[PDB]
Design a protein around this ligand. Structure first.
Ligand SMILES: [Mg+2]
Ligand SMILES: [Zn+2]
Lengths: 135, 263, 158, 1111, 37, 94, 8, 85, 104
DNA sequence: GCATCAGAGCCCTAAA
DNA sequence: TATAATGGGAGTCTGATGC
RNA sequence: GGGG
C-alpha cells in the first residue's frame, strides 16, 4: 500500500516560480522540482516554492512522464494529443513502455544491476591472462 | 482487401472511410474548376470536413458514419488504437503465443511439488521443433522434413517417437497458468511428467495459489524456449521455490483439505 | 471420515432455545398492541432476540459436538480447518436463521428449519432473495475489483 | 422393480403443456387454421389492419393466406433450408381521383413455421425464440429521488411504439412534461387539447398550491391553434411551424394509432389505474378538427392527489410481476412483421407518385423485399433467436421456457442493475427463484415456473385453489400478481381432513408477506410446491435439504447431461420425469387403442381399431446441434396390446418413458488417497467395462468445390504426390467410404485447386526437373481430419450443381458433407454431476480390485469426497444416497416429491428392511460376523454410533440405519477404520469432455494485420498471454521469458522464423527483433498524422523498417 | 516470499498491485471504501 | 526443488544475477559442445535413456551443477567480451 | 449542428 | 456506391437482373432458379451467365463485422494470413 | 544502432508528403474482373509496393537480380511485398481540414 | 450548478 | 438532352472536469 | 448464449 501511496504523492504544484521558468499553478513531479531547486540553490537564485499534491491512482497514472505508459492506460486520444504537441520523448524507464516495444523489461534478469554479469571458468580465465601479461 | 475461403471478399472499414473522403475531395476539385456558387462549394467543404472527421475519429462529432443498411459505426483510426480492443491493450501489452496449449486439469497426488502431468499428445505439439531435431539425431527419420510428415497422420506415429520426446523434455520446465491471473503465482513452472490421457495433472499444494478446483477448471501450458527463458523458469518461477506469499510473507503452498484432515 | 444424514446433530438445546425465543417474542408483541413500544422499536427488538437465539444455538451445536462427539465429521472438518465454518455447520444442524428481504432489511420471521430437517417452500423462497442479491453483488464487484487492479498496476509498474 | 411414491399432497391439476408458451403464442400470431373472416385482430392480422389502407389512389387490405410448406421439416434440415410457408395477400387498388378497382393476390415471400415442439428451422439448423420480460405499458407513478416529497408520473408505451413521458413537478411549482429528453411546462400542451382555465380549476383546484401553479397566463392568451404552433417551435428548432406541418408532428407522436401504440395490456392497465375507459390505444385523438384528450388529464389528476395524500393513490412497484409482462414468440415476430410491413408501405407510396398514375396494378406496386428482409433478419440475427439447446430433451424443453430481460427492447449488461435481477416477492409461483445463470447475467435470464402460464395480455399467472369457509374447493383460479395480492393464500401443505382445513393455525401469505392465520381467514391455497420452481429445479429430489446456490447448479447442469447409450432414470425421482419426456416429444406414443403390427430398428407399425395401419418411422442416430445423438429405440414387441398414450419408442436420455440424464451408481462417500481432492472424483474401471457413461457423438464435416478465376476445384480421388495407403478408404470419386475408421491427418474428401502465379518457383522447377516429374497443374486441397478428432464414417451427402433439385450459392459447383461418429467411453478429465450441484472431473480410474468393497464382495462404483458437502450445504445428495442404499437391496426406485417427500423415519423403515436382505442372507448362508467388522464396530462404538452392549448384528443394523456400512479397502483387505456412507446416487456425464477441450500448438495461422497467432482451438490458435499474464511474468522478473512471449512466440516475424530454424537445427533461439504489431502502431499513428520516431542515445532516428519505407 | 532481503531488480510495484488487487474479489465499508481511498 | 537451490542463492547478491550466470554458462556449454566443462567424468549429469546412461543434454542443469563446484568465476567487467569469445573458441572448437 | 438541416 | 467499382452499364444489367427475379418470384410464389431467370432475360442468357453475373455483383463484407453480440471477436480475427510464409 | 527513446510529434504537411509514395487519386480498390488492384487507387502497386515478392505487376521483371528497378511498362518496384505494410500514400485536400483531435 | 466525456475484470467455447 | 416539377425523415450509472 |  505504501508503494502505491508514494506514487499518489509523486507530484507537486508551483506556488512561486522564483528565479525559474516554472509558472504558478504548474503541476510537476516532486523529483523534477527538487532536482531543479538544487541547481538554483547552487546557482544562487531564488528556488521554486512548491506545495504537496495528492492525486488518486488514475490521475497519477495519466500524468506520468511516459506517454506510451499513459496512452496505453486510458484517455488515449487526450494523452496522445498533448504528447504530440509537446514533442514528448519516452525514455523507456518503466515496464509498460518496454513491453509495448517488445524490449527486455528493466526488472529481474533485465535489470542493469545483474544484466552484464560475466561467467568464466578458472581453466579459461588463467589461459587468457598469460598471453596478455606481456608485450 | 482479402479473398476469404469462399472466393468472397472481406475488407477493412478504413477503405470505406477513405472512399467517402476521396469522392468528396474529387467532387470539390471539380466544383471549384467549374465555378460553383458559394452555397454549393460551402456544402461540399463542410462535407469534406466531416469525411476527414469520420476517418480519424468516427462518432466523435456528429452522427457516426455507418455502412448502408447496418447500424454499426465504421471502425476509424481512433477506435483501432484505443479501448480494450484497441491496438495497445490487445496486441501490444498482451498477445497470443506459439508453443502454448490448454486442457482440463485433474489432481495428481503422486506428483512431487515441482512436477505436473502433461499429456503426451500435447507435449508432441508444444515441443514439435525439438522433437524433429531429436528424431534426426537418433534416426527415427532420415531428416527433419520427413519427420514432420510422419507426425501429420496419427497412424503413421510409431512408438519410438514417444521415447524421443522423453529425451527432449529432459530437465526442461513448462509454465502452467490458470485464469484469472490475479497475482504472480497464477503462473508457475513445472517439470512435465508425460502421461497418457488428455488431462493436465496439477499438484494439490499449488491449487490454492491458482485458486484451482477440479470442477472443470482448465489451465494453459507454455514452453519457455531459450536457455535464458528456461533458466528463469527453473530458478525464479519453479513452484517449489515459491512457498511463501509475496503479499503477507505467510506460507502459500501449505496443507489443506484432505491433507489437513488426515493429519 | 464420511458424511451421513445423522452426522448433522440437532442439539437438544435447540427445542429449549426456541421455547425461550417464543415466550420472549410474545412479551415484545404485547408491548406493541398495548402501545408500550413503537413499530420501529418492535422490529428492532425482534431482530436482536433472534440474533442472540442464533448465536445460542451455534454454541450448543459446537458444545454438543466437542463433549459428546469430538470425532464427528462435520466438527472435525470445521475444527481442523479442512472445510466448513461455524455458520455453515449451524445451518446444517441448527436453524438457518434470519434472511434478508429483496430490499436489504431483514425478515422478522426467521427460518427455523435446518438443512437436515429441511425447509418449507415458503422458507426456501424467503431465503432465495438473499442468495440472488449475493450473486448479483459478487458479479458486479469482480469488475470493480478488476478495474482497480489495472489502475494500481498502471500507477506502480515502473 | 417397484416404484414407491411418498407424499400426502393431492395436486388438483396437472402441469400445463410445457411448451405452450411457444406453441400457443405462434399459433395465435399466424391464425393459419382460422377462416379469414373469423380471424380476431391480433398478430399478423392486426399488423395488416394497422398498415392499411395506404393513402396518396388507395391500396386496401382484404385478407391473407398462408400456403403449405414447400419442403417438410426433415428435408429443410438436410438441405440447409428454412421451414416456412408462402404468404399471400389479396389487395384492392382504388383510385380516389376516379373509381378504378384492380384486385390481385400478391406474393409477400415466406414466413417461418414453428414445429410441433415449439422450435424453428432457420437455414437448416433448429432455433428457439426466447421470451422477453419488460416493463408493461401503462401509467406509472414513482417517488422523485431528488425531492423526498414529490412524485413523477411516467406514461410508457410498447417498445419502439412511442416516447417515454415524464411529468415531474418542478421546484417553481408548475407541472412540467418531459418528452424525448426536452422539458417544457405541461400547461401549454393542456391548452392545445382545448382546455380552458375554468376546466382545470373546476376539475382539480382542491389542491391549494399545486393546481394554481400549473396556471400560466401567457399560455392562455391564445386559442388552441396558437398553442399548438407555439409548442412545435419548442420541439423542432429550424422547421417552419406551418400549421399542417405542426399538426402532423404532434398527431403522429401522440394521437396516431399507427406511430403510438399503448399496449392492449397498456389500455387495460391505464383504464384500471386512473379509473377511466380508453376508446383506443393512443394518448389523444384528432376529432372534429381539433385534439381531444384521453390520458393526459386523468394522469395529471392522479399525480396531484398523490402529492397531497388523498386515499386511493399509491406509488407503483415497477418490478412487480403485475407491472412486468412477457413478450412471447408471437408478439416478438409480429413486431418485426409490422416493421417490415411499414417499410413495404414506404415503397407503395413512393411508387404511387411516379410511373403513370393509372397504369399500375397491386402486383407491380408492391416490392416484398422489405418484408422478407425484416422476417429473415429477426430469425437469423435477432438476439432472442438462439441456436437450440438440444443436448438432451430437457435442454430444449428448458430453452423454450427461458425468460430474458436483454435483447432488442430490453436491458444490457453494461446497463442493468440490482432491482431487475432481484427475486421479487411476486416471482412466487410465476418465475423460478432458483434457475438463473451464475455470473454477469444473474437474474436477467430466468425460467417459467412449472404451473405458470402467460395470459393474453402477457402477465404470468399462477394457479390457486379457492377456500370457502374452511372447505377447499377444486376450482382453480389462475391469478396475475396484481390480483393475487388481494387475498390471504394458505400454503399447499396445510393439513387437510377430506376437503377441510384440519389445523387451527395455517401458514399463509398476504402480499407475499408470511403470516400465521386462522382457517376462517383463508381465501385461497397453493396448488402444489412444484408451482414455485422451474422444470429443472423440480427434477431435484430432497430439494428442501439443499442450499439454493447449489440447487441452482443442479438445475443448470441437467441441461448439460449427455444422452448415454445405457441411460437410466434415477432411483430417487420427483415424479416429473415422465411429463418432461412426454412434453419434450422425443418419445413416441400410441394415438388410439390398438395392436402392434410390426417392430423394427427403423420403424414401428401399429394397427388401430379404426383399421388403418399407421407407420411411425423412428429417428435413428440423428445428430443434434451439440453433436449428441438423438436416437429413438422401440420399446414394444410385435403383437403387443396398447392403449391410448402408451409408450412405443424411447427417445434419447429416456428409459421406459422416464427422463434418463445419467446413471445410477454405487457411491462411497470418503477420501481416497488425494485422487478425490477438491471435487475430483474417483471411479471404478467397472463403469467402462459395462459401458456406463458411454455416449455417441457425431461431428459434421463439410467442403465446397467452387469455380475460381484459375479454374474449377474438383472433388477427385486423384491427389498429387500421395501414396495409395493414404487414399485407401476413399471411393472412386474421392469420398471416404461409409464405415471406415478415420484418424487425424486422414483424408475425408479429396479436392484439387489450381496453383496461383506462384507457379512453382525456379528453385522448385529445377528440383522437379531432377526427378523426371513435371510439376502438376493442381495442388492438394483435400479435407482432412483435424487434430484430436475422428471416428467412424456413418454418412456422406454430396450435392452438385446440375443435379435435380439442387442449386448452390453462386460459384459453388459441389458440396460434400461427411458425418463421423464416435463412441465416447468415460475418461480422465470428463465431468460428472448429480442433481444437487455436486460436480467434479474424473481424476482417477482404478482397477476393480482397488475399489472399496462391501464384505460380500460388491465393489463401489464412485468415491466422492465428503469435504464437498459441509461448505456447500447440499444435504439432499446425502438423503438421496441413504434412500438409494435401501433401494439397492430392496430392488426399488422411489418417487419423493419436493417438499412433500420421504422423511427420515420413512427412510429408516426402508433401510431396516434392506439390512435384513444385506445381512440375513449371510447368517443363513452359514457365515457369521467378520473379525474386521468387529474391529470397525469397536471404533464405531467409540464414535457414539452404535449402542455399547449389543450383538454385532444389532450394531451393524444401527449403522445401516444411519446409511453407513463396513467397507473393505481392496488394496489391503483391512477395513476402513470407520463406517462409511454408501448408497445409490444419480450421476450424469456432462457435455464438457477432455476430448473436446485438449488443444496444443507449436506454430500455426497468424492474423492479417497484427501477425499474431489466431485464437481458438478450431483455428489451431495460440493461447492469449494477456495483460494480467504479462504482469505475472513481470513480478517474477522473468525478462527473457516475457520477451519471448512478446516477440519470438508471436508477431516478431524475423524472430519466429529464425527461432524455429534454430530449434530444428539444434542451435539456441536467436535474440528477438521488433514485434510486427509495433510497426503497425507506428504506421497507424502516421495515418493520424503523428510522427513517431525511435531514437538512439544520441537522439538520432533509428529506422525500424530497415530502409523499406523511405524514398 | 523468500523471507530474506529483497534482490535488486525485483519488480516491486507490480508485486504491490497484485498483492492488493488479488483479495479484491472476496471483499464485502467494503471494496468501495478502498476505491474511495 | 532445484538441487542446492538454497546454496546457489547464497552465492549471489541478487537472485536475478544467479539466473544470468546460469543462463550465460548454459549458452557457453551448448555453443562449444560441453568440451569446456569444469566437471569431471563422474560429475557429469547423466540422462537415463532406454539404451542406458548418456550425458544430460540439458545445459541449464549442467550450469547449475558446475556452479556448485566452485570452479566457475562470475562478476562484472572481468575480461573484454570479444576476447573471451576468441580464446574459448581457440581452446574449445565448434 | 445537423448537416442536412443547415443546408436546407 | 460499390467498394469494388463496377462499370455503369454492368450495374444496369445487374439491376435489371434483380427486377426480373422480383417479377419471377412474385408470379411463382418462390425463388426462381438460374434457368428461370435466364429464360426471362431473353436471348444471350443461360443459367451459367446469370450465376457468373451474381458472383460479380457480390459486395465485400466488413472485417470488423462482429461475430456474436458482445463486442469481442471480429470476422477478421478468423482469417489466416495466406501470403507471408 | 540501439533504440533508447520514442519521440512523438505533430506532422507537417511536407513530412506527410515526405512519407507518401504517391497520391491516391481514385476511390477504386481492385478491378472487378481481374481482381488486381486499380491504378491510382487504394491498393495500387505503383504506390505501395508489389503484391508478389520481387515481381512487378505486368511481369516483365520477375526475380531478385533486379531489386530497386521500377518497371517501365507497369511502374512497380521490384522488392519484398512486405512493403505494402510500410509505405504510406496521401490524399491532397483541395481545401484544408482540421484534425478533430486538436479541435474536439 | 450543469453538461459532456470516457470509464466500467480475465481466459475459454460454439455459433457466423 | 425540353409539360412541370423548387426545404429531410426519425430515438445505465458512474466520477472528473471545463462553461 | 455455455465453462472456470
Ligand atoms: Mg473451479
Ligand atoms: Zn511491369
Amino acid at each position: 500500500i505504501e508503494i502505491v501511496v508514494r506514487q499518489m504523492m509523486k507530484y507537486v504544484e508551483v506556488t512561486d516560480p522564483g528565479d525559474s521558468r516554472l509558472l504558478e499553478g504548474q503541476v510537476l513531479e516532486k523529483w523534477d522540482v527538487e532536482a531543479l531547486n538544487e541547481r538554483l540553490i547552487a546557482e544562487g537564485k531564488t528556488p521554486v516554492a512548491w506545495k504537496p499534491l495528492l492525486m488518486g491512482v488514475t490521475k497519477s497514472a495519466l500524468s506520468t512522464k511516459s506517454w506510451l505508459s499513459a496512452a496505453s492506460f486510458q484517455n488515449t486520444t487526450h494523452v496522445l494529443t498533448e504528447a504530440a504537441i509537446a514533442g514528448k520523448k519516452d525514455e523507456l524507464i518503466g515496464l509498460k513502455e518496454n513491453v509495448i516495444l517488445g524490449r527486455l523489461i528493466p526488472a529481474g534478469t533485465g535489470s542493469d544491476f545483474v544484466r552484464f554479469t560475466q561467467v568464466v571458468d578458472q581453466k579459461t580465465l588463467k589461459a587468457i591472462e598469460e598471453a596478455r601479461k606481456e608485450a | 482487401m482479402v479473398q476469404v475461403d469462399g472466393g468472397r471478399f472481406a475488407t477493412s472499414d478504413l477503405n470505406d472511410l477513405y472512399r467517402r473522403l476521396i469522392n468528396r475531395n474529387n467532387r470539390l476539385k471539380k466544383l471549384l474548376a467549374q465555378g460553383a456558387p458559394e452555397i454549393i462549394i460551402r456544402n461540399e467543404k463542410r462535407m469534406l470536413q466531416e469525411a476527414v472527421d469520420a476517418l480519424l475519429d468516427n462518432g466523435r462529432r456528429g452522427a457516426p458514419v455507418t455502412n448502408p443498411g447496418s447500424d454499426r459505426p465504421l471502425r476509424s483510426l481512433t477506435d483501432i488504437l484505443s479501448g480494450k480492443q484497441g491496438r495497445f491493450r490487445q496486441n501490444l501489452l498482451g498477445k497470443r503465443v506459439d508453443y502454448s496449449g490448454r486442457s482440463v486439469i485433474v489432481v495428481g497426488p503422486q506428483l512431487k511439488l515441482h512436477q505436473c502431468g502433461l499429456p503426451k499428445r500435447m507435449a508432441l505439439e508444444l515441443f514439435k521443433p525439438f522433437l524433429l531435431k531429436k528424431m534426426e539425431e537418433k534416426g527415427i527419420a532420415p531428416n527433419v522434413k520427413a519427420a514432420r510428415r510422419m507426425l501429420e497422420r496419427q497412424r503413421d506415429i510409431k512408438d519410438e517417437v514417444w521415447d524421443a520426446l522423453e529425451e527432449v523434455i529432459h530437465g526442461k520446465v513448462v509454465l502452467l497458468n490458470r485464469a484469472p491471473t490475479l497475482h504472480r503465482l497464477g503462473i508457475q513452472a513445472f517439470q512435465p511428467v508425460l502421461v497418457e490421457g488428455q488431462s493436465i495433472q496439477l499438484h494439490p499444494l499449488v491449487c490454492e495459489a491458482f485458486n484451482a478446483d477440479f470442477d472443470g477448471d482448465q489451465m494453459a501450458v507454455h514452453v519457455p524456449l531459450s536457455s535464458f527463458a528456461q533458466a528463469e523458469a527453473r530458478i525464479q518461477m519453479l513452484s517449489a521455490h515459491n512457498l511463501l506469499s509475496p503479499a503477507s510473507g505467510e506460507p502459500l503452498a501449505k496443507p489443506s483439505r484432505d491433507i489437513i484432515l488426515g493429519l | 471420515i464420511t458424511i451421513g444424514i445423522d452426522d448433522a446433530v440437532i442439539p437438544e438445546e435447540k427445542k429449549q432455545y426456541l421455547e425461550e425465543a417464543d415466550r420472549k417474542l410474545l412479551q415484545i408483541e404485547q408491548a406493541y398492541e398495548m402501545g408500550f413500544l413503537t413499530d420501529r422499536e418492535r422490529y428492532d427488538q425482534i431482530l436482536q432476540l433472534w440474533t442472540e437465539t442464533t448465536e445460542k444455538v451455534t454454541q450448543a451445536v459446537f458444545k454438543n459436538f466437542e463433549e459428546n462427539y469430538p470425532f464427528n465429521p462435520l466438527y472435525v472438518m470445521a475444527q481442523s480447518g479442512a472445510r466448513g465454518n461455524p455458520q455453515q455447520i449451524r445451518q446444517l444442524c441448527g436453524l438457518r436463521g434470519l434472511m434478508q428481504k429483496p430490499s436489504g432489511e431483514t425478515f422478522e420471521v426467521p427460518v427455523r428449519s435446518s438443512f437436515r430437517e429441511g425447509l418449507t417452500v415458503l422458507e426456501y423462497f424467503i431465503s432465495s432473495h438473499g442468495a440472488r442479491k449475493g450473486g448479483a453483488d459478487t458479479a458486479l464487484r469482480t469488475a470493480d475489483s478488476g478495474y482497480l487492479t489495472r489502475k494500481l498496476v498502471d500507477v506502480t509498474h515502473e | 422393480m417397484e416404484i414407491k411414491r411418498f407424499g400426502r399432497i393431492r395436486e388438483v391439476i396437472p402441469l400445463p403443456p410445457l411448451t405452450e408458451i411457444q406453441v400457443e403464442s405462434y399459433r395465435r400470431a399466424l391464425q393459419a387454421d382460422v377462416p379469414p373472416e373469423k380471424r380476431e385482430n391480433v398478430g399478423i392480422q392486426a399488423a395488416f389492419r394497422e398498415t392499411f389502407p395506404i393513402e396518396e389512389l388507395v391500396l386496401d387490405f382484404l385478407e391473407y393466406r398462408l400456403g403449405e410448406p414447400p419442403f417438410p421439416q426433415d428435408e429443410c434440415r438436410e438441405k440447409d433450408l428454412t421451414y416456412q410457408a408462402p404468404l399471400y395477400a389479396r389487395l384492392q387498388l382504388i383510385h380516389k381521383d376516379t373509381g378504378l378497382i384492380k384486385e390481385d393476390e400478391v406474393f409477400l415471400g415466406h414466413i417461418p413455421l414453428m414445429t410441433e415442439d415449439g422450435s424453428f428451422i432457420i437455414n437448416g439448423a433448429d432455433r428457439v425464440i426466447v421470451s422477453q420480460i419488460h416493463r408493461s405499458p401503462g401509467v406509472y407513478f414513482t417517488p422523485d429521488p431528488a425531492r423526498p416529497g414529490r412524485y413523477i408520473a411516467s406514461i410508457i408505451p410498447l417498445p419502439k411504439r412511442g416516447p417515454w413521458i415524464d411529468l415531474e413537478v418542478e421546484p417553481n411549482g408548475v407541472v412540467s412534461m418531459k418528452v424525448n429528453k426536452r422539458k417544457f411546462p405541461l400547461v401549454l400542451l393542456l391548452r392545445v387539447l382545448g382546455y380552458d382555465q375554468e376546466t382545470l380549476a373546476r376539475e382539480l383546484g382542491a389542491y391549494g398550491e399545486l393546481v394554481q401553479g400549473l396556471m400560466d397566463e401567457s399560455v392562455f392568451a391564445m386559442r388552441p391553434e396558437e398553442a399548438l404552433i407555439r409548442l412545435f417551435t419548442l420541439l423542432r428548432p429550424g422547421d417552419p411551424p406551418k400549421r399542417d406541418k405542426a399538426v402532423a408532428y404532434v398527431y403522429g407522436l401522440i394521437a396516431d394509432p399507427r406511430r403510438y401504440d399503448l399496449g392492449e395490456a397498456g389500455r387495460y392497465k391505464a383504464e384500471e389505474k386512473l379509473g377511466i375507459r380508453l376508446s383506443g390505444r393512443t394518448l389523444a385523438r384528432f376529432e372534429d378538427g381539433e385534439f381531444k384528450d384521453e390520458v393526459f388529464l386523468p394522469t395529471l389528476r392522479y399525480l396531484f392527489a398523490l402529492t397531497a395524500g388523498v386515499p386511493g393513490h399509491e406509488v407503483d412497484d415497477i418490478d412487480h410481476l403485475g407491472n412486468r409482462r412477457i413478450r412471447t414468440v408471437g408478439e416478438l415476430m409480429t413486431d418485426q412483421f409490422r416493421v417490415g410491413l411499414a417499410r413495404l408501405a414506404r415503397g407503395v407510396r413512393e411508387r404511387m407518385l411516379m410511373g403513370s398514375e393509372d397504369s399500375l396494378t397491386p402486383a407491380k406496386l408492391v416490392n416484398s423485399r422489405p418484408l422478407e428482409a425484416a422476417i429473415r433478419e429477426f430469425f437469423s440475427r435477432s438476439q432472442l433467436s438462439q441456436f437450440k439447446d438440444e443436448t438432451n430433451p430437457l435442454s430444449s424443453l428448458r430453452h423454450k421456457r427461458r425468460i430474458s430481460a436483454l435483447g432488442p427492447g430490453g436491458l444490457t449488461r453494461e446497463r442493468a442493475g440490482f432491482d431487475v435481477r432481484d427475486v421479487h416477492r411476486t416471482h412466487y409461483g410465476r418465475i423460478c427463484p432458483v434457475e438463473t445463470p451464475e455470473g454477469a447475467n444473474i437474474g436477467l435470464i430466468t425460467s417459467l415456473a412449472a404451473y405458470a402460464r402467460v395470459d393474453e395480455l402477457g402477465f404470468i399467472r399462477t394457479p390457486y385453489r379457492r377456500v370457502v369457509g374452511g372447505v377447499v374447493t377444486d376450482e382453480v383460479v389462475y391469478m396475475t400478481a396484481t390480483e393475487e395480492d388481494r387475498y390471504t393464500i394458505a400454503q399447499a401443505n396445510t393439513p387437510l381432513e377430506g376437503n377441510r382445513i384440519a389445523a387451527e393455525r395455517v401458514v399463509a401469505r398476504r402480499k407475499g408477506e408470511p403470516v400465521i392465520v386462522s382457517p376462517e381467514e383463508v381465501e385461497f391455497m397453493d396448488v402444489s410446491p412444484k408451482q414455485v420452481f422451474s422444470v429443472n429445479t423440480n427434477l431435484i429430489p430432497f430439494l428442501e435439504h439443499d442450499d439454493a446456490n447449489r440447487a441452482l447448479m443442479g438445475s443448470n447442469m441437467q441441461t448439460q447431461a449427455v444422452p448415454l447409450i445405457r441411460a437410466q432414470a434415477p432411483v430417487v425421482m420427483t415424479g416429473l420425469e415422465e411429463r418432461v419426456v412426454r412434453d419434450s416429444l422425443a418419445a413416441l406414443y400410441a394415438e388410439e387403442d390398438g395392436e402392434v403390427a410390426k417392430v423394427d430398428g427403423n420403424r414401428i407399425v401399429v394397427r388401430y381399431e379404426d383399421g388403418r395401419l399407421v407407420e411411425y418411422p423412428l429417428r435413428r442416430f440423428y445428430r443434434s446441434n451439440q453433436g449428441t445423438a438423438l436416437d429413438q429405440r422401440p420399446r414394444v414387441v410385435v403383437g403387443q396390446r396398447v392403449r391410448k398414450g402408451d409408450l412405443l419408442a424411447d427417445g434419447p436420455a429416456s428409459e421406459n418413458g422416464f427422463l434418463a440424464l445419467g446413471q445410477n451408481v454405487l457411491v462411497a462417500i470418503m477420501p481416497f488417497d488425494g485422487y478425490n481432492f477438491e471435487d475430483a472424483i474417483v471411479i471404478s474401471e467397472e463403469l467402462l467395462k459395462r459401458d456406463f457413461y458411454t455416449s455417441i457423438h457425431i461431428e459434421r464435416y463439410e467442403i465446397e468445390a467452387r469455380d475460381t478465376k484459375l479454374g474449377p476445384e474438383r472433388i477427385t480421388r486423384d491427389i498429387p504426390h500421395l501414396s495409395e495407403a493414404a487414399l485407401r478408404d476413399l471411393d472412386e470419386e474421392g469420398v471416404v467410404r461409409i464405415g471406415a475408421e478415420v484418424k487425424p491427418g486422414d483424408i475425408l474428401v479429396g479436392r484439387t485447386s489450381f496453383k496461383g502465379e506462384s507457379e512453382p518457383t525456379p528453385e522448385e522447377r529445377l528440383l522437379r526437373s531432377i526427378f523426371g516429374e513435371k510439376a502438376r497443374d493442381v495442388k492438394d486441397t483435400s479435407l482432412r481430419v483435424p487434430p484430436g478428432e475422428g471416428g467412424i464414417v456413418v454418412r456422406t451427402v454430396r450435392l452438385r450443381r446440375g443435379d435435380p433439385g439442387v442449386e448452390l450459392k453462386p460459384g459453388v459447383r459441389e458440396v460434400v458433407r461427411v458425418y463421423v461418429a464416435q463412441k465416447r467411453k468415460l475418461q480422465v478429465g470428463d465431468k460428472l454431476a448429480n442433481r444437487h450441484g455436486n460436480k467434479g472431473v474424473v481424476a482417477k480410474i482404478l482397477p476393480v480390485e482397488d475399489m472399496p468393497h462391501l464384505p460380500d464382495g460388491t465393489p463401489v462404483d464412485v468415491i466422492l469426497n465428503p469435504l464437498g458437502v459441509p461448505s456447500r450445504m447440499n444435504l439432499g445428495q446425502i438423503l438421496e444416497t441413504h434412500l438409494g442404499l435401501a433401494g439397492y437391496f430392496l430392488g426399488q426406485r422411489y418417487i419423493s416429491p419436493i417438499f412433500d417427500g420421504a422423511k427420515e423415519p420413512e427412510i429408516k423403515e426402508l433401510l431396516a428392511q434392506a439390512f435384513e436382505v444385506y445381512f440375513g442372507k449371510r447368517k443363513g448362508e452359514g457365515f457369521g460376523v467378520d473379525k474386521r467388522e468387529v474391529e470397525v464396530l469397536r471404533r464405531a462404538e467409540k464414535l457414539g454410533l452404535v449402542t455399547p452392549g449389543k450383538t454385532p448384528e444389532e450394531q451393524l443394523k444401527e449403522l445401516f440405519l444411519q446409511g453407513k456400512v463396513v467397507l473393505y479397502d481392496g488394496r489391503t483387505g483391512e477395513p476402513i477404520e470407520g463406517p462409511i456412507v454408501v448408497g445409490q446416487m444419480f450421476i450424469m456425464k456432462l457435455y464438457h469432455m477432455v476430448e473436446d477441450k485438449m488443444h496444443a500448438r507449436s506454430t500455426g495461422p497468424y492474423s492479417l494485420i497484427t501477425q499474431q497467432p489466431l485464437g481458438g482451438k478450431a483455428q489451431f490458435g495460440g493461447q492469449r498471454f494477456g495483460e494480467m499474464e504479462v504482469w505475472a511474468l513481470e513480478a517474477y522478473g522473468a525478462a527473457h521469458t516475457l520477451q519471448e512471449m512478446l516477440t519470438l512466440k508471436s508477431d516478431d516475424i524475423e524472430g519466429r522464423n529464425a527461432a524455429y530454424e534454430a530449434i530444428i537445427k539444434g542451435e539456441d533461439v536467436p535474440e528477438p527483433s521488433v514485434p510486427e504489431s509495433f510497426r503497425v502502431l507506428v504506421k497507424e499513428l502516421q495515418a493520424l498524422a503523428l510522427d513517431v520516431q525511435t531514437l538512439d542515445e544520441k537522439d538520432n532516428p533509428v529506422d525500424i523498417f530497415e530502409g523499406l519505407a523511405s524514398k | 516470499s523468500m523471507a530474506r532481503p529483497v534482490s535488486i531488480g525485483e519488480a516491486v510495484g507490480i508485486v504491490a498491485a497484485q498483492s492488493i488487487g488479488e483479495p479484491g474479489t472476496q471483499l464485502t465499508q467494503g471494496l468501495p471504501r478502498v476505491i474511495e481511498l | 526443488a532445484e538441487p542446492g537451490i538454497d546454496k546457489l542463492f547464497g552465492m549471489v547478491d541478487s537472485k536475478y544475477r544467479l539466473t544470468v550466470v546460469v543462463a550465460k554458462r548454459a549458452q557457453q556449454l551448448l555453443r562449444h559442445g560441453f568440451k569446456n566443462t569444469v566437471l569431471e567424468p563422474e560429475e557429469r549429469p547423466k540422462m537415463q535413456t532406454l539404451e542406458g546412461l548418456f550425458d544430460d543434454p540439458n545445459a541449464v542443469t549442467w550450469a547449475m551443477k558446475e556452479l556448485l563446484t566452485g570452479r566457475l568465476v562470475f562478476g562484472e567487467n572481468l575480461v573484454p567480451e570479444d576476447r573471451l569469445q576468441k580464446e574459448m573458441e581457440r581452446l574449445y572448437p565448434v | 449542428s445537423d448537416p442536412v438541416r443547415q443546408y436546407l | 456506391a460499390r467498394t469494388i467499382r463496377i462499370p455503369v452499364h454492368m450495374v444496369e444489367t445487374i439491376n435489371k437482373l434483380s427486377r426480373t427475379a422480383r417479377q419471377l418470384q412474385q408470379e411463382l410464389g418462390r425463388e426462381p432458379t438460374y434457368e428461370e431467370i435466364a429464360e426471362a432475360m431473353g436471348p444471350g442468357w443461360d443459367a451459367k451467365r446469370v450465376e457468373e453475373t451474381l458472383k460479380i455483383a457480390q459486395e465485400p463484407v466488413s472485417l470488423e463485422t462482429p461475430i456474436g453480440d458482445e463486442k469481442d471477436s471480429f470476422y477478421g480475427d478468423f482469417i489466416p494470413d495466406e501470403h507471408l510464409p | 544502432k540501439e533504440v533508447r527513446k520514442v519521440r512523438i510529434a505533430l506532422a507537417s504537411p511536407e513530412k506527410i508528403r515526405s512519407w507518401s509514395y504517391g497520391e491516391v487519386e481514385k476511390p477504386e480498390t481492385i478491378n472487378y474482373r481481374t481482381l488486381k488492384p486499380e491504378r491510382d487507387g487504394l491498393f495500387d502497386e505503383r504506390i505501395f509496393g508489389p503484391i508478389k515478392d520481387y515481381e512487378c505487376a505486368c511481369g516483365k521483371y520477375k526475380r531478385q537480380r533486379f531489386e530497386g528497378k521500377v518497371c517501365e511498362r507497369c511502374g512497380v518496384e521490384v522488392t519484398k511485398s512486405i512493403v505494402r505494410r510500410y509505405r504510406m500514400g496521401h490524399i491532397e485536400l483541395a481545401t484544408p481540414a482540421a484534425h478533430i483531435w486538436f479541435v474536439k
